Amino acid sequence: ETTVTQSQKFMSTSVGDRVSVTCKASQNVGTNVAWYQQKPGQSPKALIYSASYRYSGVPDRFTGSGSGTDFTLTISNVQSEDLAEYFCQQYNSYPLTFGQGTKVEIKRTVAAPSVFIFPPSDSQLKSGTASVVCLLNNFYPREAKVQWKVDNALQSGNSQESVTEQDSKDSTYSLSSTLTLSKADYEKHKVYACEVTHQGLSSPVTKSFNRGE
Amino acid sequence: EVKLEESGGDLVKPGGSLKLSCAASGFTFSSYGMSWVRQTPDKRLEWVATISSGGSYTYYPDSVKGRFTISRDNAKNTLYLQMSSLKSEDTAMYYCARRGFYFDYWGQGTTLTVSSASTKGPSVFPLAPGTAALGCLVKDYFPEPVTVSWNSGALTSGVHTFPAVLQSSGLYSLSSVVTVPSSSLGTQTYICNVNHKPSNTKVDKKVEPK
Amino acid sequence: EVQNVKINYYDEDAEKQVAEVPVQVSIDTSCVNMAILTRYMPEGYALVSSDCIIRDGYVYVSVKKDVEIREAVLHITFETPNGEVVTTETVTAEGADGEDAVFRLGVDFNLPTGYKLSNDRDQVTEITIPFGSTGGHTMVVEKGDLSSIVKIQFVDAENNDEVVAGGDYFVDGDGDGIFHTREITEWVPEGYELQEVGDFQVELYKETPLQLSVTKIK
Ligand SMILES: [Ca+2]
Secondary structure: OOOEEOOOOEEEEEOOOOEEEEEEEOOOOOOOEEEEEEOOOOOOEEEEEOOOEEOOOOOOOEEEEEEOOEEEEEEOOOOHHHOEEEEEEEOOOOOOEEOOOEEEEEEOOOEOOEEEEEOOOHHHHHHOEEEEEEEEEEEEOOOOEEEEEEOOEEOOOOEEEEEOOOOOOOOOEEEEEEEEEEHHHHOOOOEEEEEEEOOOOOOOEEEEEEOOO | OOEEEEEOOOEEOOOOOEEEEEEEEOOOHHHOOEEEEEEOOOOOEEEEEEEOOOOOOEEOOOOOOOOEEEEEEOOOOEEEEEEOOOOHHHOEEEEEEEOOOOOOOEOOOEEEEEOOOOOOOOEEEEEOOOEEEEEEEEEEEOOOOOEEEEOOOOEOOOEEEOOOEEOOOOOEEEEEEEEEEHHHEOOEOEEEEEEEHHHOEEEEEEEOOO | OOEEEEEEEEEOOOOEEEEEEEEEEOOOOOEOOHHHHHHOOOOOEEEEEOOOEOEOOEEEEEEEEOOOEEEEEEEEEEEOOOOOEEEEEEEEEEEEOOOEEEEEEOOOEOOOOOEEEOOOOOOOOEEEEEOOOEEEEEEEEEEOOOOEEEEEEEEEOOOOOEEEEEEEEEEOOOOOOEEEHHHHHHHOOOOEEEOOOOEEEHHHHOOOOEEEEEEEOO
């Protein structure tokens, strides 16, 4: 039963650059290999069949090659809209099997996140929980760090973070972090601060509010 | 022209059964092999069944053999997948796909959740506001697909809807924001339209400053 | 940060590995150029072929011994769609006489600074020239930045629009002929803040300057 493997989990490439995604079959599969592109929020789209043939409408910059066990999808002249997970697949035999997926991201100038903070609504306090939200908008390096400080005291264990996929036009990210707290705990302290560090900041940036204002 | 449209995904208890359907159009359905592929939360793709054009040949991987069966109706132009003895590990998005080797067209997917938990509809809370940022917090729902649009889908510039996170309570939660001209606040009305079909919950939340 | 790659030099005639050379390359490349492959060529051997591709940390190179080593030479001409020559460059590679050198855009040679591949047609991105021979190729390019010069004067609105400062500023990188004052707030005079704001038309200000109102801060 033939397995296919993609050894690259993540590749980073600049616009106009070249990027080669690799695929290794555990047995000779001739050219019975296919490639797929999955853009975020979308279902997989068929790019290449039998190792090197493009479907009508797939642009020339997508090139598949290989035979036997080693297969390759080369994206030349990469566009910011080419970001996606790219999957290879062997259909030489049943079971049909897929590689694990190679995420292709675009590199761009460092971009500093714009930071906002949201107090909990009055509907939510009425019901007994308090959710405080920190938004970090349109930044590059995906890497970032959010610290929730209550009355100047750093928290942990009551925060969850979420990151969008890379935007297809500009090539930025956005991040949401939620500080969840009981209504009891919420109105005991006054100062709620969101401490943000990132490569585009020379120092941590803090947004904050006082409960009530 | 080619279109494949799946339905029937639902929340099912472990050990249960459920049947998926796929309505096919834009092509001569009875001439094509057809398949089902699922995608797990870790985004891995796993092929689950294929059927020849006339139904004579069907194929399954060992992970599902004896529990899943594939059929078609070449009069209704419909593909089916019956599943029984469902396990937690069958939780996936199920795609219908054309042909039986590579897959040249895929549908949009329908979502199967195998769990002992019960449906719960979301609470919807406003994230109240150069540019201003406003948004919408969608808290404590369980079966997974929630959809969020702004102003009935007409406002898309600057919208960021964040992936759902799994809270320690077993409930999902999610935020959606958008950036707008600050001078539009107090003229324009901004509505976040939340739909959680697993609970037949539909909310249109006006988000305003205060 | 950099990437460690192992070059596997393999003699397919001898059916033996001749050398496995570890090298370091930029962290975000997946294709190693011929110049690196031949820099670390084991002595007595010549390049026959390589797909350049970094495959789970390895580049595979077919090499051969006791053959004559010759340059493939490529004169690349970069032209813009109207036939005007941006630049010309010659790149070379050495390998076994008569085998194929494959020159690949962005690994073995680069576009002129400020240019990209033209969106007006399909063209090849790899050029195959046998070692011991000379070839030519014209690649069609277009400017990356379409910014135009626009003349602007900042003008004191509380003193009868007296000129404070001015110059010729680059705007409209997309090239649609419209520009916005966000593109020139970098240039507002130091003691002043910009009051006249919005969109403006490039073609209108190549000869007489656009006057933008400004006022003294605080
Ligand atoms: Ca413009």
